């Protein structure tokens, strides 16, 4: 018996990224970037700050051009592994990015010399979240999709909330820039007040989860949305939004989400979403099949393309999103078939008026969830949930029982659990991080139990009593008496 933890003298930890080829862990922290072995041993360290800067000055920062400059810490805002480089964006210097070598983070691969206002990527405020994903273009070139919340106490026009950026363009000094129409055009960024939670790729599209204010409906309310855009759509013709809600609309603020990840299926097709009454009580976990998402998004496209965004009964079901001056249309019925990602003749920025609704698979009184990870052990579905008090809940979900919170432990008192809950390559451990601590938790703490009566007293879907060997163990190491719903008894 033995554990494994990583700390940086109280320095905060912002993001965590795992290299699927080598298992190497990259950790973004305030003024640091760390490279760790799968057992959390330090392989290399890069300093990223502090720097004399101001959210009003532009990079390069000439000390004589910025008289309001002060020593500013650099919390990490984006940390993504791409096929042939590591993508790192900080909070300083208007959120500029750089590429570093995988396995050699001290080797700088690309940092443009004079970035323009088209290359200010991440949020330059450590209190505002940036999300991102890496994908492929039509000829295999690497692309970077970014979701960035509102900050404006900086320069230029507000960076669009969602953008598509080139990682290997012809001119390397143009890296991280976006084409003029490859973005989401939104007017009052301050008022919609985007707060991004997650981003993921499914099929040939990119998806974003975020909160923003619904300004057209009454009450000026924060709502949860999922977005979808074709990966190859360079004009965002294909953009569409859907509101998400749970328990009949009682829960509409999403806090974190995840798909199921396991040895069997790497990325599942159901989105498990945590809801809580927190804005920028009881928490709930709800399930959104990604098929249902695409179904409603497809119905929204057809209705705004061909029936003026109205349903057969004449009811408004879709509309043009945000403050874009445009309109739904009466295009031919076969327009979605001919142009699934849109054209310059089709209504763009679309939003569905009809929400996608789910039922709660689990309720947690007095808990505020902040992170979600889901996996499968022999057909059973297990969720690992972090909360705002530093605890890690383990829950059995399907097929039976469902309301089965079977374990709970404290990682760091009063310190929220980070959304970047990551599993190792063999899904035997969960990397869990709070504000100042990173821990490698075992998913199956079975060998702790010595006798059958002990192995069965502490019920755990991973664990069960073998009789061939004297071990309480996982199922896939043996006849096996399950600890959760035992098939027999004891002696």
């Amino acid at each position: 018996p033995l554990p494994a933890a990583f700390t940086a003298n109280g320095t905060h930890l912002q993001h965590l990224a795992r290299d699927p080829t080598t298992g190497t862990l990259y950790v973004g922290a305030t003024n640091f970037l760390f490279q760790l072995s799968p057992g959390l041993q330090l392989e290399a360290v890069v300093s990223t700050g502090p720097v004399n800067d101001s959210r009003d000055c532009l990079p390069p920062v000439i000390p004589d051009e910025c008289p309001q400059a002060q020593p500013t810490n650099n919390p990490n805002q984006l940390l993504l592994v791409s096929p042939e480089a590591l993508v790192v964006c900080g909070s300083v210097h208007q959120g500029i990015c750089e590429l570093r070598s995988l396995g050699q983070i001290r080797q700088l691969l690309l940092r443009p010399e004079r970035p323009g206002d088209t290359q200010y990527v991440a949020a330059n405020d450590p209190a505002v979240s940036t999300v991102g994903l890496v994908a492929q273009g039509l000829v295999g070139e690497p692309l970077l999709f970014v979701g960035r919340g509102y900050t404006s106490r900086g320069v230029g026009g507000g960076i669009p909330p969602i953008t598509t950026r080139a990682l290997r363009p012809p001119d390397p000094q143009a890296a991280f820039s976006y084409e003029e129409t490859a973005k989401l055009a939104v007017g009052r960024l301050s008022e919609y007040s985007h707060h991004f939670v997650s981003a993921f790729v499914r099929g040939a599209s990119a998806y974003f989860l975020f909160l923003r204010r619904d300004l057209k409906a009454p009450s000026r309310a924060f709502r949860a949305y999922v977005s979808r855009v074709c990966l190859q759509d360079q004009h965002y013709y294909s953009y569409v939004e859907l509101p998400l809600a749970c328990q009949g609309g009682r829960y509409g603020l999403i806090q974190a989400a995840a798909v199921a990840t396991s040895k069997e299926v790497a990325r599942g097709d159901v989105l498990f979403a945590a809801f809580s009454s927190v804005a920028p009580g009881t928490s709930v976990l709800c399930a959104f099949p990604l098929d249902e998402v695409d179904q409603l998004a497809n119905y929204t496209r057809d209705a705004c393309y061909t029936r003026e965004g109205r349903a057969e009964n004449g009811t408004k079901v879709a509309d043009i999103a945000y403050d874009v001056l445009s309109d739904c249309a009466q295009l031919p019925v076969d327009t979605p078939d001919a142009f699934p990602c849109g054209s310059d003749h089709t209504p763009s920025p679309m939003v569905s008026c009809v929400p996608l609704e789910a039922t709660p698979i689990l309720e947690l009184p007095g808990v505020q969830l902040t992170a979600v990870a889901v996996t499968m052990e022999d057909g059973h579905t297990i969720a690992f949930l972090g909360d705002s008090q530093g605890q890690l809940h383990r829950v059995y979900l399907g097929p039976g029982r469902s309301a089965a919170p079977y374990s709970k432990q404290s990682i760091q008192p009063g310190s929220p659990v980070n959304r970047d809950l990551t599993f190792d390559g063999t899904f035997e451990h969960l990397y869990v991080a709070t504000q100042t601590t990173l821990v490698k938790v075992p998913v199956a703490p079975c060998a702790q139990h010595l006798d059958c009566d002990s192995c069965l007293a502490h019920r755990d879907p991973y664990c069960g009593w073998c009789v061939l060997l004297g071990r309480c163990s996982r199922r896939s190491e043996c006849q096996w008496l399950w600890s959760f719903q035992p098939e027999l008894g004891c002696l």
């Epitope: 940086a8 003298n9 109280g10 320095t11 905060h12 305030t30 003024n31 700050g49 502090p50 002060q70 020593p71 500013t72 810490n73 650099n74 919390p75 450590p126 209190a127 009063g414 310190s415 504000q435 100042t436």
Partner: nanobody, 122 residues
Framework: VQLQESGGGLVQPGGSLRLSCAAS????????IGWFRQAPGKEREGVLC????????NYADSVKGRFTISRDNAKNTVYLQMNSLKPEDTAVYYC?????????????????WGKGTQVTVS
């Protein structure tokens, strides 16, 4: 996310004063907090600094024995007790929070600042 200093004023040499710094939009629990000051015409400088636990405190030379610092993680507030004030102490006093080496009382880099409060000694 906001830090708001308050309690400035105009005292004469030998006077005392107590400043507060109230945080909003985040919890100060795992942050180090420092007090800075900038006089008209000169550069900003660190005055006092405290770690997240409150067990480590660092002072600038010019204030040792006179100023003290204390924190209250439940009220999200930090206080700066200024005693035996002198004309050289006249400046705008700023409060800041740091997510960097918060177990120590370094306070070199800063995450958030306040707008400050003016303190004048005749």
């Amino acid at each position: 996310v906001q830090l708001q200093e308050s309690g400035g004023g105009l005292v004469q040499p030998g006077g005392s004063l107590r400043l507060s710094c109230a945080a909003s939009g985040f919890r100060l629990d795992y942050y180090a907090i420092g007090w800075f000051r900038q006089a008209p015409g000169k550069e900003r400088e660190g005055v006092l600094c405290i770690s997240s636990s409150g067990g480590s405190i660092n002072y600038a030379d010019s204030v040792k024995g006179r100023f003290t610092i204390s924190r209250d993680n439940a009220k999200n507030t930090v206080y700066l007790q200024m005693n035996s004030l002198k004309p050289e102490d006249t400046a705008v006093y700023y409060c800041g929070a740091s997510s960097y080496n918060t177990q120590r009382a370094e306070c070199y880099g800063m995450d958030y600042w306040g707008k400050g409060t003016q303190v004048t000694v005749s």
